[PDB]
Amino acid sequence: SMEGILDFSNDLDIALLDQVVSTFYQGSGVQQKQAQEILTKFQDNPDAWQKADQILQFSTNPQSKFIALSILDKLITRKWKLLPNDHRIGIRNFVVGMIISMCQDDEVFKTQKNLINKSDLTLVQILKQEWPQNWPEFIPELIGSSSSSVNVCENNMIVLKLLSEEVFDFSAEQMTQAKALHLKNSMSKEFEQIFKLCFQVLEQGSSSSLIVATLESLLRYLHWIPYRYIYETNILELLSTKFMTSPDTRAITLKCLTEVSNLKIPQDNDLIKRQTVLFFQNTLQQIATSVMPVTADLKATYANANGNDQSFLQDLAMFLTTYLARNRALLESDESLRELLLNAHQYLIQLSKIEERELFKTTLDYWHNLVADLFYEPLKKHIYEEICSQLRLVIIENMVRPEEVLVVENDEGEIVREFVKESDTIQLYKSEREVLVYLTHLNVIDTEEIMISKLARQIDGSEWSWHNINTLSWAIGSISGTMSEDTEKRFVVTVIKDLLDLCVKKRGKDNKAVVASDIMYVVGQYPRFLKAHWNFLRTVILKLFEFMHETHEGVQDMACDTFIKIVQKCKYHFVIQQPRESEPFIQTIIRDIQKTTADLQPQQVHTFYKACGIIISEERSVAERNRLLSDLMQLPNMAWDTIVEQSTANPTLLLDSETVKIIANIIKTNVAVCTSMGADFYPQLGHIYYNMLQLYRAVSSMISAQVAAEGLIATKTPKVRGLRTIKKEILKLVETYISKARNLDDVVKVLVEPLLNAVLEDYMNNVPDARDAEVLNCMTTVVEKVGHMIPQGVILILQSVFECTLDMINKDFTEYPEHRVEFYKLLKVINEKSFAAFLELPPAAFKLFVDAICWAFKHNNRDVEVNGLQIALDLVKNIERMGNVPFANEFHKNYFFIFVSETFFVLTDSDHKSGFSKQALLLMKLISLVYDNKISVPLYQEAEVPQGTSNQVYLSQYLANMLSNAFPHLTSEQIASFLSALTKQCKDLVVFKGTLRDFLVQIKEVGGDPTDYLFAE
Amino acid sequence: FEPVMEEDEEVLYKVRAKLFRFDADAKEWKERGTGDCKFLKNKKTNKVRILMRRDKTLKICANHIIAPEYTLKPNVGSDRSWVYACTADIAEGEAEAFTFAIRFGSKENADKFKEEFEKAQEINKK
Amino acid sequence: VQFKLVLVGDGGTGKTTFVKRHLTGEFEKKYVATLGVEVHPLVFHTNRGPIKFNVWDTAGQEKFGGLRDGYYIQAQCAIIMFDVTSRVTYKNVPNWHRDLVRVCENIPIVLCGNKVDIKDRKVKAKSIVFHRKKNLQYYDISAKSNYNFEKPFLWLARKLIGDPNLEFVAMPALAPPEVAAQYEHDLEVAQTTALPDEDDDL
């Protein structure tokens, strides 16, 4: 019964319409979902706009009228110039008439402002289409009608507000360059009249409703109008005094003054500077007397959240930071402005104590701006000495937890390990560190005194707390590098001693975990001090080893990160033999590695072996390094040697899930050490390589055998997943080493040969769900590093992975997402390093290659999209490099227009806007080949065009015909003008892209002006 | 001078877990909640139940007796999960029937869960 | 007490996945584009009693827009969503916000950057500043990892109830009841259907 309004043959029952509308907004459940579908079908009916006047006059529902105007908006924006002139004036009339009617009825104007704003916006859409060329008296008539009434005048400010937004703030990407410049100049020419009306209202007005609307419109004008309207009138006085006292106008006025503040003023004119000083001086005076003094507790006010206090404190912060970042120097030389300068900053100090991360970031951005200037600008920092001192307390007391601290208090009072990384506080910590480092350089004595005294009031318990000891420790760690070595020495010594007292005094598993994490972070942040104090560095490392036995997993996991963090910076002191030591400390670490890492989780053990690898690589005595390496790998190599004896003698131990886990961890240990030793790992790789590749084969047979006996579901079992982990870690170890190898002859002669034999055929002959995308990733590194040395090896890779992988990923854009990405990385590196491998492909396989590239264009996945467009560019270049040879000639004849049309399709379908730049670049290259005559042969068949017609002519005909059928609502002239402009600009990427953007605008509407494509002249 | 739900229940076991429900009309598992799964013993009736709440929202994603009729079966894809049928769970209003699966951080926790689960069934027989 | 919340943002940003996570607890991996809008009641239990959100989860695709801004009428709160792995989605936040505040002139609004669980982040934290001048609350979230997933609704509930100390609380747990050849079929299918994301920490 609700579907009656969808029959347009019979007349439209508005009573039924309002019921469907009410069922959608006020109803629920199924009745709501059914009405929603009906209302969509009604709105999307191309004749629905003819019911517009009917619904607006006779409907007793404002939502029904709103939806009627949405139907008109869509009609005006997309099909206006398709209507006869009769309906264009008729539609204009009952839109203007509806606005007038609603403004004269005070009750309607009061209670239906949503419907009035939608009507105003609909009117503005008409203006964009026909003002001023077909409506030159719109602004004069608007100014006149504003004297006739207050409601009309107020509503006229809304129309002008929306108009300024649509022309200046949102015209780009919604209209052509030509039409945007037309409406900007049209509005600019008639603005002096608009300003008079707006200024007269502001001066004599008393209707808060109309004043706010006028200030709301003024906020939009300040985005583009000449400076003289702002400064050469009395309007800054009005904004900074009158409209700051009343809270009804304060919020919008403060936003108006933030836009003025952001302007870069003529720095030679003394009066502009005087005015810029004055509206600031006035504004801060109104705050102090009408809102709150500079001593007020803004932290408490924000937390209370009365009325709009939180929004006003936000706008205030935005105003103070904008103005001062631009104009504080205007206040720094005049002694009579000094108090104003400091009061403004004192409000900022109070704003920086609010508990609201995003607001704190806004203020912290300004502090960084300030301290960075005081760090370089002569004779400035003494002005802000007191401000900076207060700021040191604010930063230190609001330090966020560093990424390295892995302990945290839960909702039970317990100290525990973190579930997930606090990814949204990484950036905030770096920002606080950056400001606090600057503040420390500006007064290192003051910062030390704040931190030492604060730490002294932690010992005696004056201010002991987990929050307080934490922020303090994090602050101490974050300023590393600002002090002198000698001051840092005395400083750190005192911090450790006081922190070592706390861990004794504060007992309990929770307390001990807090202080332990804080000492770890501080010590780990001062490498310079550890290098110079070997005996302490040694004690630290040994105490970290003790924490590797802590039952508290947070402490334990952090001791492992701290260890490798210290090693990355102090590695050199572990590889040499220190005085009073019988051997380099790396030899003591390795000898007890089983005891030290006994209670660690396997991936923590790997981090430990990687850290040892960092140290071993500092030894440049090849003999000694290789000796250390084999000592480190002694445990995994003894475990390895036993596995090989058992597996090769009886391929049924790998059935044991426990043995699979042991193997995987051995390979993972070799990955960890290889990651940090790189080229120096080769001796260890050679010890396991040939046996490791045999294990890859044996594991592969097991996986296949279990898929055949249990089905595809077997790939989800822990057994098979364990076997594939072995294969993936082996691939990762070979990828990791080849990516850092320095001796590429050994890679070719020793490694690549058996590698390709072990992986390629296994990949090719497995079922899709059993293929490992890591194969593709490994092969990409092989081609990247040595592909230029194994031309026949690259061919073998294509034959094995190209067609079978393409068949996996060419049925949709969703399945096998890992294979999809690595596939196009592989084609990319091959195309730029071994293009010859593609010349050796049979014509049919080279056609799948081209199909594969255009397939990547149509992805929304950015990972494969950008590679698809890059392969296409590089393929074009690889071909033209060949010159006038048969393969290049036949390439263009076969695939040139395919790339042009496929590039065009993704440019214009509104589903691939993310890759517009590279699409445009690719299309520009293609067109420039023809207009430079770099295609040697004709792009057309002998009998489709006169003899001797140039490729330029035929290209313009092919494209004209293509666009004509793809976009039949375009006139022949639009297409011809567009192509003429496009081809003339194939050496100007900026202009070429502009011409494309203008096209994407015009295909969204009817009647686009073809001269718009002459904009670049 | 004048100046200015579970409390009647005992917790027998607690472990962090992720809970799933099997959508038969789609033949896929759909996650239902991640948080702390508790075995709660009523001190008035001595009847043990599972009560699980989602983190942050604290909404109930499991609430039902650990009936002696139930039995924990393994899932083909995991060595740290258990599957079993539940005939009366009131996490979302009226007592619905569900095929649940619950997964844990380690196989060690999954096997401990099974030990405590069976202990509770014995309690719920007396 | 109940409030209408409109959810807007580019297609693919995770609006429907986000709501569905709060409704059922499930994480949808597929991307079925919303057609027009879907209304879902959503209750939260707080110390100030229960609060109901009627979530109007709108479509992001233009071709599936439907009534577009007609969905925004009489909304009392809203969430604007984007995808931190897609720059274009953040570039369009001013367009969505524009269409939203032209209907809803004065309502609490949250800006949400979804999908922070993906490591190759594209919209850096430093770049996200649109919310400052527009008085929007901002949150990094992930419907996949549940990172900050409750923050948008907690903040809105405080702004709508007018209590900054409003907190989510534990809904009381009533005693459950004590209670034939199909449950042997349904269970055998359930065991042989592998659980999703076996590589997750949970």
Ligand SMILES: Nc1nc2c(ncn2[C@@H]2O[C@H](COP(=O)(O)OP(=O)(O)NP(=O)(O)O)[C@@H](O)[C@H]2O)c(=O)[nH]1
């Ligand atoms: N990695 C990751 N993916 C997510 C996350 N949230 C949603 N997705 C995924 O993004 C895709 C689209 O989700 P969807 O909720 O339909 O987006 P939408 O905003 O509702 N699109 P539309 O406007 O067309 O309805 C899904 O595949 C979903 O799995 C997230 O937090 N992390």
Ligand SMILES: NC(=O)[C@@H](Cn1cnc(-c2cc(C(F)(F)F)cc(C(F)(F)F)c2)n1)c1cncnc1
């Ligand atoms: N003394 C105590 O009760 C506590 C105090 N405490 C907590 N952490 C440390 C602690 C921590 C480290 C660290 F570098 F690993 F972080 C180094 C040292 C060192 F070099 F001074 F020895 C002490 N000391 C304690 C706890 N566990 C082992 N040793 C000491």
Ligand SMILES: [Cl-]
């Ligand atoms: Cl998940």
Ligand SMILES: [Mg+2]
């Ligand atoms: Mg959706």
